[PDB]
């Protein structure tokens, strides 16, 4: 039974052999049959002769068109991060700014006490983070957990329309360097991601399980309470960190990982995640869906501010997927309910 797996709704690791690697969706539907969604947030280690890149010397030249200082403002826990966007660079410029003493990750020994320093200091010495850079690293004829073309569901999106949505269904590169943070979030539609490390210092996550998201959603609202009366999803922000100290103190189910250069992390639907990098480095993400994702993006609450554009048309998959609810769908009147245990139904095998 689904309830019976990973009941913990623990971050589970795996290391595909070559063999399971190669079929993505089916990889991702297996997981979800050990329970690895549960969590919210997967690693996966790839088979150690694979390789998306021959080498990472030939790009000092690739422009970061709009690098991000990441201005921290809050307490006790609780932070708003408000952007402020500095000229374009070169990875040359920006990795020589990311290890100068003014920036370089301290000196720690447990990973516990550099975290133990991001939470203390996130709000000093604001950082500036390469983020949300079209493009791609992979060499173009990598076939294997191609971030630029995986081959899912939600390919439906362009292949129908012809709509593309950067990030979304395009890949975006992220530069970070020490104390850049990614503010706690689900993805845009509740869809799944996916995010390689490609080179550099760990990127450190925190998880929250898929069936215990409406609790951080109530905890945020109660935190953040002009922001909840302004927007109905004001996390889609993502501008709002919250310390796993605070977490702790109000009850809310989490775990951390630190993600290492090599190593992919998978998220899931509905699946909050945040975390920060821990020095300089290079990851590239993307979403992606599944059949099971389909019924989360028909529910998926989505900003009523403005502020967040993204909006997929659900229509199509319903047509497709789930005929037999389309017309009461259309009606409001699909009343189906969401059970954040069950893995999507490619896993049966
Ligand atoms: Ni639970
Ligand atoms: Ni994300
Ligand atoms: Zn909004």
Known sequence: ??????????????????????????????????????????????????????????????????????????????????????????????RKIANSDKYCTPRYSEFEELERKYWKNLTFNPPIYGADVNGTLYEKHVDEWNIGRLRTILDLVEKESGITIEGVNTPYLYFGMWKTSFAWHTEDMDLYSINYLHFGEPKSWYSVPPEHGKRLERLA?????????????????????????????????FDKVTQEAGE?????????????????????????????????????????????????????????????????????????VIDHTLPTPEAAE
């Not at 694979?50 to 970061?64: C, E, G, M, T």
């Not at 006790?76 to 070169?90: C, D, R, V």
């Not at 109905?232 to 109000?250: D, G, N, Q, W």
């Not at 993400?285 to 501010?305: D, P």
């Open 264 to 336: 992919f992390m998978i998220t899931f639907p509905y699946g909050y995640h945040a975390g920060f990098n821990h020095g300089f480095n290079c990851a590239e993400s993307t979403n992606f869906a599944t059949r099971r994702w389909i019924e989360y993006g028909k529910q998926a609450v989505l900003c009523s501010c403005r502020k967040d554009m993204v909006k997929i048309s659900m229509d199509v998959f319903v047509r497709k997927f789930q005929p037999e609810r389309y017309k009461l769908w259309k009606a409001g009147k699909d009343n189906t």
């Open 1 to 94: 039974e689904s309830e019976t797996l990973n009941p913990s709704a623990r971050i589970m690791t795996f290391y595909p052999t070559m063999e399971e690697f190669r079929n993505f969706s089916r990889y991702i539907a297996y997981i979800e049959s050990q329970g690895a969604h549960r969590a919210g947030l997967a690693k996966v280690v790839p088979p150690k002769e694979w390789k998306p890149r021959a080498s990472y010397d030939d790009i000092d030249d690739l422009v970061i068109p709009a690098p991000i200082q990441q201005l921290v403002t809050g307490q006790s826990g609780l932070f708003t991060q408000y952007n402020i966007q500095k000229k374009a660079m070169t990875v040359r410029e920006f």
């Open 221 to 253: 609202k109660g935190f953040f309470p002009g922001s909840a009366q302004s927007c109905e999803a004001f996390l889609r922000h993502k501008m709002t960190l919250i310390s796993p100290l605070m977490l702790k103190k109000y009850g809310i189910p």
